[PDB]
Amino acid sequence: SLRRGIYHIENAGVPSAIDLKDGSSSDGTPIVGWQFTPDTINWHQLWLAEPIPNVADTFTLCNLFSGTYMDLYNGSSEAGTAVNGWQGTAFTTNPHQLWTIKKSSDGTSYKIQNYGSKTFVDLVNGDSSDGAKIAGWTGTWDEGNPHQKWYFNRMSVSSAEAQAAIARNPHIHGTYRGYILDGEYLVLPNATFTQIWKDSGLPGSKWREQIYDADDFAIAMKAAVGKWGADSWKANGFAIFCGVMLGVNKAGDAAHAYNFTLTKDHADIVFFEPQNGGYLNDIGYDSYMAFY
Amino acid sequence: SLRRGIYHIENAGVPSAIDLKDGSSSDGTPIVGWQFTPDTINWHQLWLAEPIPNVADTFTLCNLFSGTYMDLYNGSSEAGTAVNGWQGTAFTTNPHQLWTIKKSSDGTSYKIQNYGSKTFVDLVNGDSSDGAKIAGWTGTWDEGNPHQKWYFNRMSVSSAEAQAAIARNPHIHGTYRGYILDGEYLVLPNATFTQIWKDSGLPGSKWREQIYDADDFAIAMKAAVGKWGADSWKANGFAIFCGVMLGVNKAGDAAHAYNFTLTKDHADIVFFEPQNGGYLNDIGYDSYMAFY
């Protein structure tokens, strides 16, 4: 089963992602194929999949940027029916905005079927052009047709997955306690994490005894990433991943506060020094507390 | 013994505080008597007392706003010698900036003796006027003279005192853990705490599921009070008191994030709801974690 989370949905035949054109929130904004840059935020190409209770393998797909939903125009079963962004809600009964998403016959890519029409999301003619039509189209669950096959590239972690990444780190103190704040987190590329730090004003901040020391830098960086999340995205029901840690040195006679993020593969954490924007696999402290 | 901390130093005879005139950081800025408003920040009238190691009951007195030190001009023992703000450091050997501070003969007020001159801080003629001269003057430890007696009104708590205030609160969960970040905290009047909240932009922020929910409001308010501390004061070696708490309801099936501050008497905590600027003695949750 596809898990709740944020996905970059990439065609199996050509390197085009599912893109809400210009990120527009207007009802009837086309959803098109468009090229993408790996290890960036692809602003118009992130989709929050919300599972519908009591309907197997069926979701709403909310564009993270617009807050509008993938919508099969008037729910038509005609091949070539427009797929657009449309206002909706996460747990709608509107079958225009309900999608059954199950593994294709290759067992790695998915097919996306409209719950009402039973037609499939189709990159028409496998066109790799920027702005290529995506439509509802006749098809079957089992056929090889790459026009209708989609890799769901997972961009988010659960709190359970973030907890597992911390737990397998070699720099955790015996007394460690973690405090989880949210459920599902967008994982930032370091390039984006760095840009939020640069735009925070922290690079210019000076260390001062107690009044602006490590704990002030680490909390300011978490607040900046929280503010950036709310200001950047119109969808709800996720958070941005940015942790605060307190740590103690080997000798047990000095402590430090810092941030952490996750690797590309979501398996491990990486420490971030908000006083100089450095990423470290070893920051010289073992964490005794985190909140994220 | 006077404890390390921040003090509002009020004459025992007339309601004048020790004031660094216009808060100026210029060397030789007069220190004068000036009237004050209780339950405000008296911006030019707060003094950080730093104990000198291996010298009994002897301190530097650093103006919180200017970051400059109470200085007996050229260390003269002549009655009427100027007391000014002057650049220095927290642990100086300059006897112009070293003050022996011990209880007067009334056992409640203090006298302030220059370590070098052995003359006392004196509100000349007990003048209650705004801008009245304060000078080094002949005197004795035991005499009743109110010109040379000073109430040290304590404006800060230690981390130990903040921990005690939390521990005697009736809304702490059995599983509570606290994480202390700094050593000595300026306690804000609610009027100032509220002003920092109003100027943060949080009053305009909307609740949004995960992406800007209670934990985002509480962390944003702590970051705002941290930023205000660094931006407002030039002294180092203290922090501003503002806590974050996570709490769980009676039924154990809902949790919430919020802030807390301290009462005027420094004995108890008060909860602060950063989503509406309310102060509460009961916020409907029992704290299972705090950092402050």
């Binding site: 704990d215 006679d253 402590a255 430090h256 506060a257 | 202390i180 700094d182 050593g183």
Partner: peptide, 4 residues
Amino acid sequence: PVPR
């Protein structure tokens, strides 16, 4: 100790 205390974080710095």
